[PDB]
Amino acid sequence: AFHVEGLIAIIVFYLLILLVGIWAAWRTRDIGLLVGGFTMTATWVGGGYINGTAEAVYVPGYGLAWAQAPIGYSLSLILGGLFFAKPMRSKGYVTMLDPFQQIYGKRMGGLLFIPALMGEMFWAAAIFSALGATISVIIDVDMHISVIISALIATLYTLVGSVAYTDVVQLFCIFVGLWISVPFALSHPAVADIGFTAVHAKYQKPWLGTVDSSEVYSWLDSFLLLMLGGIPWQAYFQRVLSSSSATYAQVLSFLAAFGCLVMAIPAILIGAIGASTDWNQTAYGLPDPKTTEEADMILPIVLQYLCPVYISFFGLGAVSAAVMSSADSSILSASSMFARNIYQLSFEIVWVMRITVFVFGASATAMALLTKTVYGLWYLSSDLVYIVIFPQLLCVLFVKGTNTYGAVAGYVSGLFLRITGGEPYLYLQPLIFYPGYYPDDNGIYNQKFPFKTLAMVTSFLTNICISYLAKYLFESGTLPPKLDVFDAV
């Protein structure tokens, strides 16, 4: 079962990427704009992005229409560059979570940090699942062992320790490996026409998908979740604030949105090919990946089984090295974020950062083992950030007069509505039943009502209303000044 040549391919491509990265630091017509756009693009585009996009297009329930994560995450970059970059630079922020700490305080900073940590952990679990899937496909060792060993190598690389300009190299490797495999994948005999499969059903439901009239309010509820929940993220905002000029940051965000839209095209195409593939003709055989509960592995499966041996060896393996190189970047960001926001500011740093790396890697790989979807992990990472952080970001940026009381009230109300609405991915039953609820195969009632958008708006309006209410109570003198536990007013 073990294949030596796949491991050699990963090792050679990883060493080549590392050599280019250290050579860039060894060297250390105004094309810095293009390189900055590539760098901003390479943050979101990784194993999780392309694997989740291919999965979302591949699954019959979703199709391309419900694959809102690439389009929504590009529109998040557009909306950030338009509206969020200029307030952030105008107010002089240096960190994404700095606005929360300035107004709400350090303890509420940690309270808002916890959903950010969980979003980072969901994203890292999706990245670990994608990387383990790719490794398990090409090396042909078991999925669980692949995830464990890949996460362990990433954890040791983060733990032990030049290496400059690597993001452009990983993005170029992913782009070349995908766009040199799509012509071979499309030309495979098993794959039918993807133009015909888009609107008509041959092997499964059409991969464009459809949105029912009742589901439209649901659809926007998802689309607003990914488009607005993808904005308050640390990896985007650190490079936004790092830029010297504001217009430079806006044009970088626009170029990044363009690059994300372009990089989604091979992922959507591979998802379409997987939805169009007659797997009985391929070496994968029957049952197909969605019956095998391996629909989250569709991108490595197409690149391995629908491409020639040399094309597979190069393209799938350049993708593997790039994804493993990008995997440790999320671990580093989340670990430094934990070390600085909680342990350093609120309460020598190297030991606690080491333990943070170890625990975050173990939790991410454990949930990568437990979960069976990459797109679901991506959506769930967006979900909690959209519910909690985004109303608070709107309140600290565009709303004047918000305070800690309204922050906690909106936090509690949004989390109460979100929890009582029920999350099918985490196998949580719903307590409050909005109109249009229906039970799925698992017996978890699924809401057709936009309860997540309602929860977001409720949290935002509760923040505003409770902030102004507490301000009026303390200003007029209705409540005693002694009962000021949060020191907001």
Residue numbers in the entry: 2 to 29, 47 to 179, 183 to 368, 376 to 517
Paper text:
Mammalian sodium-coupled high-affinity choline transporter CHT1 uptakes choline in cholinergic neurons for acetylcholine synthesis and plays a critical role in cholinergic neurotransmission. CHT1 belongs to the mammalian solute carrier family SLC5 which also includes Na+/glucose cotransporters (SGLTs) and is classified as SLC5A7. CHT1 functions as a symporter that utilizes the chemical gradient of Na+ ions across the plasma membrane to drive choline uptake. TMs 1–10 constitute the core of CHT1 with a classical LeuT-fold in which TMs 1–5 and TMs 6–10 form two pseudo-symmetric repeats and TM1 and TM6 are broken into two short helices.
The CHT1apo structure adopts an inward-open conformation with a solvent-accessible vestibule extending from the cytosol deep into the substrate-binding pocket at the center of the transporter. The subsequent second Na+ release from Na2 ensues the straightening movement of TM8, rendering the transporter into an inward-open state ready for Cl– and choline release.
